[PDB]
């Protein structure tokens, strides 16, 4: 189980123009170039998509795993999923033969899971571990996000900008109190 | 009979009344699921098949070749172990007879009851029985005298067509006994006790230890500090390390007395005393000679005298003379404490003559 | 009221085995913050060392290295046995008290009031069976006799009923040993045809 | 038999029905896995082989009978005691007992082979009667044929209320209790094998909050701990602890009794399913029976003689199809040594009842009259 | 159960002209509009912050509840609380070809538990490998003047702290603060169990 | 059970003139227009009529519920009630047939409850849930309120005015200590 992404987000989809309107606009001085700001939003998206297990820009992933968990399951970790592209099933060397039937993607923010039809799920050869490419995330743009999750990115990327090293300074709906409802709540630490 | 015209038209004329829906989900969970519900039925069914029978109403105790050899398959005792095994399980015993001959039918087949349903009809007694396996019916007929099915019922106070089957009465205590044995089965299979924990906080509030340190820490924990051969190694804890030993505070007895009380209220319903099957607890009966005598008097001989009386009427429709057929309650080994104090009572009554005490014991006078 | 205590205290235990959560422990992961979930690569790693090495009967006592942040807080189950156990057996006995059976007869555990089943089965056919059957047969004696001119009296036998044997022994041992009167005078005391 | 056509076509006529899915696994982890399930079968299987048999046809004279010549040695290398313990050892284990018979001469077959019920499967056939049995070892069938008069296999069944073709096998009824007794014994085997109790710990924090001790200090610390402070010979050394050091003594808070009362209660439910009394095999607990004249008499009356009287009843009917005359085999219930207290009070009642004559009490006790 | 919304708030329905008067920015200048892209950017970030703590909707946009299996037998509670006029209950199959069903479902309107409550003792059956989309418009009112004013005041108390401090800087809450106003709009549930 | 109100309070019944006499009068400067003040009193009435379950201006409600609690009860939540207007009893589609007998309103500040005559209360059809329109509240004006409840509105609406965001600053009879005697005190969390 690796879950590397296919393509990174371009930066032209990130709101480097709307971040400085959060950062110094209305109150302040009309400071740094776009390459300094964009290094702080994706450093704040990747801090929140790691704490909440989300994706937020809807790029494409590839989940390559070696054993299914159940035979009617294997929940996917990145939460908002849509349109699992292919279920490639490589052999050892891998002429790379895909399968096209047997499973149904169930789009669900709780457990995005792959839930094969019936009771049997596509098995794995010896050495030829199965890979899933899926496109998980809210929307292709920034305007398709939930706004409280998009605000906590701006509240955090303005923290990484306005104070550089790990220095000193909790408000009611802060950074933590906004992403506490997008995190995954699980209480199974067990065998299944 | 006069009230037959009013209960059958309300129950539905000429249709099959199915009755209990859970008559087979209690069998696989209360007879093949727990040993108390298993043993209590097999204790009674093997016992009622063991008591011999006598043919009265003939004016002298002699169809006894039919019962000792009903068919090609099950034997005399195999027949009653299957017949009573349906009355104790589902409250209903059924007996197919095939009769190519006009009287005294050739074979007796215990039709199992969960695939069997009645149809009341227009009046009184049921008109037919439907043996429905798969989707296929049979529709026996009762519109005649020989009536190919004897239907033995236990007592049911609210229903007019079936029995109550004490497994239905103890259906909660079967589920308490199944789950409490599945509580301990699961708890041995999914429970993490640790013998302790080695806590590495570090210089910070948190810190993992390097893989050169973790392979070192396993090796001195595996080699020196685990096993029966290593009980008590004084475990130098350095700066930062700490050994916090965990316990396991509820260790024994997870639902132990609720299971034993559930294991006895299964034995309470079927009628067996708890000494016979082996339930631990208080000594109600003393020395098994009164526990076996209480078994063959409270729940075996009342059960077999109602089945043998229904065999007595249904088989006497095939041969012309009406037959009586009741358990002997003699040459049965459990009633010997009942029998010897009878032989000691009138045996020491020396006032009455020798021909007058042979008639009290059931001896032919000479 | 006692049937509703025994039906519900048995459904208390049936429910408690069916919908109740005991965990054998809990593995607390707070993290560097006050609150932190663990990554999905970390969560599969945590289960796999918990599923394989730390659960089961075959793994009872693994010393469980807990690094920074982690903690294992063992849970308990503080009432384990005996959920309404003594109020169910006391409610089981009041059911047996109303109908009139002795509790040794049906098999309720408790104190041995009667001794040895020659008493309790003799107390069963004298306090709650033969008073009941002598009035069912007394209504059958009067209702049936209206169908046939002559009056009929049906009553239980109180002879060769097998639980009244210890009553019948001390009747035959008193009159059998009292040898001052003759043989034809003690047959009518015991109920025998005279000779 | 009239109902035979609809019950046979339901499961599928002419094709094998395999039966229970885990009786081949319960033999490995419930009979060779725990001692209680092991002993409960071997106590019953070696008791039903001990009881003699009676061959009777209306005069009972057949003590030289060919069936009693057959059963005395069934086949080469398996005696009478080794046949029935292998036959009852299949009935208690999988609910099904089987006997092959090979017959060169068309009457009284020469050998009886206890075919094991793991690898046997029925064929439900046309009229609700199993037409064939398939002995499947490896991937190879045999298909015995019972469309004849001798029908080469007797099929001893225990009672099964749901299935039409097999038995229930009390091991399968106590399969949850076998898994508690197998696992609570492996709880203690594991706990003795991978668990860490230390007798104490010697804390060295140091001048900082955290500090290891030098390698010259570590050899010094072990050498005063190995030589002076460990062992039975050093129980109570007063242990000067200078600055920084501390000895925090550890404990082991559940010491005894890890699932001890739920293992013995699970041991008794194994003994409850097969039907042995717990004083017979040796389970500790309350003395239900008193003094082994009761419990061994309750053993041959509740779970041995009801079992043996129907195995011999199937042998009475299957063998008699090989020789014209019908045969009745039943256990003796005389000179079986656990029914002596039953036989005493029979002989003491009729022995002391001196109102009837001597030739009238010989027939009550079962003696030849004189 | 995805629960994505069909359309969003248009932005003309948010009281930026009133939130500007709340912030005490400035009255009579020739500029007067330099923060309309900003004051509206924190009203959307404080409405959607309170919609996540109270599970309310506040503007009555149209939602879509795409799920694959009914939770219970008949009721099917909706997450967003103030509901009115469920537009369509469609019942999709394996591939497209959605067929709307009147379906005997009826929507009990209640701000406690907004549920569907099948009237034919069963919800309409879902095909194997098919979804169910409940289209509904949930919320208080179409404009801002239809909200409960205690909940609308908590939006202004909260969006003004996103305005007056940009990064996460720590700030004693007032008697009826932000948290004390939305705490009677939260969902009070005490079921962690199987039914 | 919804309980939406029929008509909102007009604002000409709210004391926007008497609030500024609390706010800056006697001590201070003789600041904001009426639309800014009136947005703070109804934001303080709705904070106290939610904490104390009251109504304070006596507008009309409609309580539409699907099952009665008892058959001689169904306490009404908004506390000071007077003159239940109608007991409409709709069917499915709803030709909307009212009933006019069977119940008695019992005006009580503790449990405003509807208490049908005898032992039987008007039952509900399948699907046709019953609605109650009632006019609960103290008085039509502001001068009919209890003055301690009307003071705690002014003590709270002067808090929402004089400090804008959730900032820093308990007096003996404060806001909480004045509305603590108008709140509903119930200790039934049970089945009935």
């Amino acid at each position: 189980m690796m879950l590397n992404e296919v393509t990174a987000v371009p930066g032209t989809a990130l709101p480097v123009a709307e971040f400085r309107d959060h950062l110094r606009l209305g109150t302040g001085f009309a400071g740094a170039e776009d390459a300094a700001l964009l290094s702080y939003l994706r450093a704040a998206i990747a801090a929140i998509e790691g704490r909440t297990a989300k994706a937020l820009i809807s790029r494409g992933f590839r989940l390559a795993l070696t054993a299914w968990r159940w035979g009617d399951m294997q929940t996917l970790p990145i939460a908002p999923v849509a349109t699992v592209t292919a279920l490639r099933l490589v052999d050892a060397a891998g002429v790379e033969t895909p399968v096209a039937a047997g499973w149904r993607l169930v789009p669900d923010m709780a457990r995005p899971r792959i839930e094969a039809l019936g009771a049997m799920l596509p098995m794995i050869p010896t050495g030829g571990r199965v890979e899933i490419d899926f496109t998980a995330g809210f929307g292709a743009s920034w305007s398709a996000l939930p706004v409280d999750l998009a605000q906590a990115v701006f509240l955090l990327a303005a923290q990484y900008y306005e104070l550089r090293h790990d220095g000193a300074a909790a408000m009611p709906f802060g950074v933590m109190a906004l992403i506490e409802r997008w995190r995954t709540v699980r209480v199974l630490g067990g065998r299944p | 009979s006069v009230t037959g015209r009013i209960v059958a038209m309300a129950s539905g004329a000429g249709r099959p009344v199915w009755g209990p829906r859970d008559t087979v989900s209690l069998m696989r969970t209360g007879f093949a699921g727990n040993p108390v519900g298993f043993r209590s039925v097999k204790l009674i069914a093997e016992a009622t098949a063991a008591v011999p029978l006598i043919c009265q109403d003939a004016e002298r105790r002699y169809v006894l070749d039919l019962l000792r050899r009903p068919n090609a398959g099950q034997g005399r005792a195999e027949l009653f172990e299957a017949l009573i095994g349906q009355i104790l399980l589902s409250g209903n015993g059924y007996l197919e007879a095939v009769c190519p001959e006009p009287g005294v039918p050739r074979e007796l087949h215990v039709l199992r009851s969960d695939r069997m349903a009645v149809v009341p009809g227009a009046d009184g007694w049921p008109v037919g029985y439907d043996y429905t396996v798969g989707g296929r019916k049979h529709r026996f007929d009762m519109t005649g005298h020989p009536d190919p099915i004897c239907h033995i019922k236990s007592f049911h106070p609210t229903d007019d067509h079936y029995g109550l089957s004490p497994m239905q009465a103890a259906a909660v205590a079967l589920d308490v006994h199944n789950a409490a044995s599945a509580w301990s089965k699961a708890l041995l299979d999914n429970a993490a006790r640790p013998s302790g924990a080695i806590i590495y906080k570090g210089a910070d509030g948190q810190g993992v230890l390097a893989p050169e340190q973790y392979e070192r820490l396993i090796f001195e924990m595996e080699t020196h500090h685990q096993g029966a051969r290593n009980a008590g190694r004084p475990m130098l804890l350095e700066g930062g390390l700490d050994w916090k030993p965990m316990g396991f505070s509820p260790s024994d007895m997870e639902f132990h007395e609720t299971k034993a009380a559930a294991a006895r209220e299964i034995a309470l319903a079927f009628g067996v005393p708890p000494m016979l099957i082996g339930i631990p607890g208080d000594a109600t009966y003393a020395n098994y000679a009164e526990a076996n005598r209480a078994f063959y008097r409270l729940t075996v001989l009342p059960l077999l005298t109602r089945v043998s009386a229904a065999l007595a009427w249904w088989l006497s429709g095939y041969l012309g003379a009406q037959i009586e057929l009741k358990p002997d309650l003699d040459q049965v080994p459990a009633l010997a404490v009942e029998r010897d104090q009878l032989w000691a009572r009138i045996g020491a009554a020396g006032f009455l003559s020798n021909s007058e005490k042979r008639v009290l014991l059931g001896l032919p006078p000479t």
Side-chain angles (χ1 to χ4, degrees), chain A, chain B:
Chain A
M1 181 179 174
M2 180 59 74
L3 191 130
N4 50 3
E5 68 183 3
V6 176
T7 59
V9 301
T12 62
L14 299 179
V16 69
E18 293 180 354
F19 174 67
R20 63 178 65 188
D21 291 334
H22 173 268
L23 190 62
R24 285 170 287 111
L25 192 277
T27 51
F29 329 94
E33 199 62 28
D34 295 330
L37 294 176
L38 189 144
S39 175
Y40 291 152
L41 279 84
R42 64 177 63 192
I45 291 167
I48 294 172
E49 77 180 4
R51 178 61 59 86
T52 63
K54 298 291 183 286
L56 286 80
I57 307 293
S58 74
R59 85 292 304 274
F61 291 97
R62 281 190 293 114
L63 191 154
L65 85 169
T66 317
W68 301 103
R69 188 67 179 172
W70 290 273
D72 54 352
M73 206 65 73
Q74 191 52 248
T75 64
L76 280 70
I78 304 298
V81 302
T83 312
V84 168
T85 300
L87 183 59
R88 293 187 187 176
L89 182 61
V90 74
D91 46 357
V95 184
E96 196 80 33
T97 60
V99 299
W103 73 97
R104 55 174 293 173
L105 191 274
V106 176
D108 195 359
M109 193 69 74
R111 287 177 293 114
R113 90 293 295 268
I114 203 167
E115 270 190 359
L117 271 301
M120 183 177 174
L121 199 149
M123 295 186 288
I124 302 165
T126 60
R129 85 287 191 274
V130 53
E131 75 96 23
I132 302 99
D133 52 349
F134 60 96
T135 66
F138 289 101
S141 68
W142 182 261
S143 66
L145 275 80
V147 190
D148 57 349
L149 187 65
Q151 176 55 246
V153 172
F154 285 164
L155 293 177
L156 180 60
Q159 181 180 183
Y160 286 166
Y161 181 78
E162 292 181 354
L163 65 94
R164 284 293 197 265
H165 74 287
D166 196 358
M171 60 185 286
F173 284 94
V175 180
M176 291 296 173
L178 283 176
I179 67 170
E180 76 173 2
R181 67 173 291 267
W182 294 100
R183 58 188 284 273
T184 301
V185 170
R186 63 267 185 103
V187 290
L188 188 271
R191 178 178 297 113
Chain B
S1 293
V2 178
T3 184
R5 305 293 297 166
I6 192 175
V7 64
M9 67 180 289
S11 179
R15 61 168 46 185
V17 178
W18 293 102
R21 293 179 291 174
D22 55 355
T23 186
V24 72
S25 180
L26 285 172
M27 294 183 181
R28 63 101 176 171
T29 62
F31 184 69
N34 52 0
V36 178
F38 175 75
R39 183 62 186 165
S40 301
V41 174
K42 193 176 180 180
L43 200 72
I44 297 170
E46 288 179 352
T48 64
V51 179
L53 295 169
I54 46 95
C55 172
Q56 281 182 298
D57 203 348
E59 311 324 51
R60 69 274 182 179
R61 283 83 91 99
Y62 287 167
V63 78
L64 269 298
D65 296 334
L66 175 63
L67 294 177
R68 291 187 292 113
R69 185 71 263 171
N71 64 34
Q74 48 202 355
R76 187 258 172 86
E78 292 85 352
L79 187 73
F80 288 93
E81 286 175 356
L83 201 161
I84 307 300
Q86 296 299 292
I87 301 173
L88 296 174
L89 266 291
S90 65
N92 300 296
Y94 294 93
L95 283 171
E96 188 181 4
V98 297
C99 52
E101 298 294 327
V104 58
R106 293 292 91 195
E107 296 176 354
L108 293 177
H109 296 281
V110 176
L111 295 176
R112 53 179 290 176
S113 64
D114 52 352
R115 301 186 299 185
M116 178 63 78
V118 314
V119 47
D123 186 1
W125 331 101
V127 173
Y129 293 91
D130 292 333
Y131 187 78
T132 64
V133 51
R136 298 176 180 89
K137 289 165 90 285
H138 187 272
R139 187 60 62 86
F140 292 103
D141 51 351
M142 298 297 162
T143 61
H145 182 70
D147 286 329
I149 304 301
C150 185
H151 175 56
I152 299 99
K153 295 192 288 183
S154 296
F155 173 67
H156 202 288
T158 65
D159 197 358
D160 291 328
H161 299 288
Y162 296 102
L164 189 54
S165 72
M167 183 169 287
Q168 183 179 359
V172 174
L174 295 170
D175 293 335
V176 180
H177 191 271
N178 283 316
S181 64
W183 191 270
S184 297
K185 176 185 180 294
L187 180 52
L188 295 171
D189 293 333
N190 52 21
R193 83 180 301 269
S195 174
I198 171 167
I199 285 95
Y200 181 71
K201 301 297 287 294
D204 295 325
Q206 65 271 11
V208 310
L209 67 162
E212 62 192 5
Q213 289 179 346
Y214 174 68
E215 194 270 331
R216 170 62 176 268
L217 196 277
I218 279 179
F219 181 78
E220 284 189 352
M221 194 66 68
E222 170 185 1
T223 301
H224 303 292
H225 288 282
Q226 293 185 8
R229 64 184 293 273
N230 293 317
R233 290 276 171 81
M235 190 173 285
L236 202 161
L237 297 176
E238 298 292 338
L241 286 174
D242 192 5
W243 174 259
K244 183 175 73 68
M246 279 76 165
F248 181 69
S249 178
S251 58
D252 290 326
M253 295 178 183
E254 289 287 332
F255 291 93
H256 177 69
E257 292 293 328
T258 64
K259 184 175 75 173
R264 194 176 299 115
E265 293 176 351
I266 298 165
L268 192 148
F270 290 99
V272 300
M275 184 174 288
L276 292 182
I277 64 171
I279 298 298
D282 55 350
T284 58
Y285 298 104
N287 54 1
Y288 166 74
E290 72 188 10
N292 199 2
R293 191 260 304 274
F295 177 64
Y296 278 81
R297 176 59 44 72
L298 297 175
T299 183
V300 170
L301 265 65
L303 179 58
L304 177 63
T305 195
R306 294 190 291 109
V307 175
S308 65
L311 282 170
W313 181 257
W314 174 63
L315 292 173
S316 66
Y318 291 95
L319 75 159
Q322 182 177 358
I323 190 170
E324 285 174 352
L325 191 146
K326 62 180 71 67
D328 192 70
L329 66 154
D330 185 72
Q331 66 181 355
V332 284
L335 304 175
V337 66
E338 176 181 357
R339 192 181 299 113
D340 61 352
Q341 68 178 358
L342 175 63
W343 278 73
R345 179 174 64 83
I346 62 99
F351 59 92
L352 59 92
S353 70
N354 197 1
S355 66
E356 296 177 358
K357 60 184 72 173
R358 295 174 64 90
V359 71
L360 292 175
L361 300 177
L363 272 299
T366 62

